[PDB]
UniProtKB/Swiss-Prot annotation:
Comment field (misc): Lysozyme C is capable of both hydrolysis and transglycosylation; it also shows a slight esterase activity. It acts rapidly on both peptide-substituted and unsubstituted peptidoglycan, and slowly on chitin oligosaccharides.
Gene encoding the protein: LYZ
Annotated residues for binding of substrate: D101
Organism encoding this protein: Gallus gallus
Known EC number: 3.2.1.17
Residues annotated as catalytic: E35, D52
Subcellular location: Secreted
Protein name as catalogued: Lysozyme C
Catalysed transformations (reactions): Hydrolysis of (1->4)-beta-linkages between N-acetylmuramic acid and N-acetyl-D-glucosamine residues in a peptidoglycan and between N-acetyl-D-glucosamine residues in chitodextrins
């Protein structure tokens, strides 16, 4: 599914991401924009053999099982395919574990490089929230 910007903001708010670990909704929406362009089916192979999955490009080295990342863990206790669903629940639940890991949203390199310190409220501007 390719979400609209305000459609995704609404879903993320419904699932409890607004101000989760102190990160306003705009941060999450900005992260999703640059990670996946709001496409739940986005995948990206990494040089280390792991793969990033879904709207927030969650990685198989630590977070999900894809059966093809040697030495990896599955800390979200899910198949990586769950992260590609039109229903963002698995991605949101897993993102909550990731952002609590100690480095906050710096876990998403695209957030650090493209969202952090910017006017992230622009990403939710206009939306019925
Ligand atoms: Br947009
Ligand atoms: Br929109
Ligand atoms: Br909704
Ligand atoms: Br919910
Ligand atoms: Br929930
Ligand atoms: Br929550
Ligand atoms: Br915001
Ligand atoms: Br990681
Ligand atoms: Br594996
Ligand atoms: Br393996
Ligand atoms: Br594990
Ligand atoms: Br699993
Ligand atoms: Br949803
Ligand atoms: Br959720
Ligand atoms: Br879940
Ligand atoms: Br933090
Ligand atoms: Na894994
Ligand atoms: Pt939820
Ligand atoms: Pt929650
Ligand atoms: Pt939902």
């Amino acid at each position: 599914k390719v979400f609209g910007r305000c459609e995704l903001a609404a879903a993320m708010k419904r699932h409890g991401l607004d101000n989760y670990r102190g990160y306003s909704l705009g941060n999450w929406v900005c992260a999703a924009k640059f990670e996946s362009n709001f496409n739940t089916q986005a995948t990206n192979r990494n040089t280390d053999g792991s793969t990033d999955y879904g709207i927030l490009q969650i990685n198989s080295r630590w977070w999900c099982n894809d059966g093809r990342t040697p030495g990896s863990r599955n800390l979200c206790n899910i198949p990586c395919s769950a992260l590609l669903s039109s229903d963002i629940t698995a991605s949101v639940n897993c993102a909550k574990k990731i952002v609590s890991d100690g480095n906050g949203m710096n876990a998403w390199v695209a957030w650090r490089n493209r969202c952090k310190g910017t006017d992230v409220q622009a990403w939710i501007r206009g939306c019925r929230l």
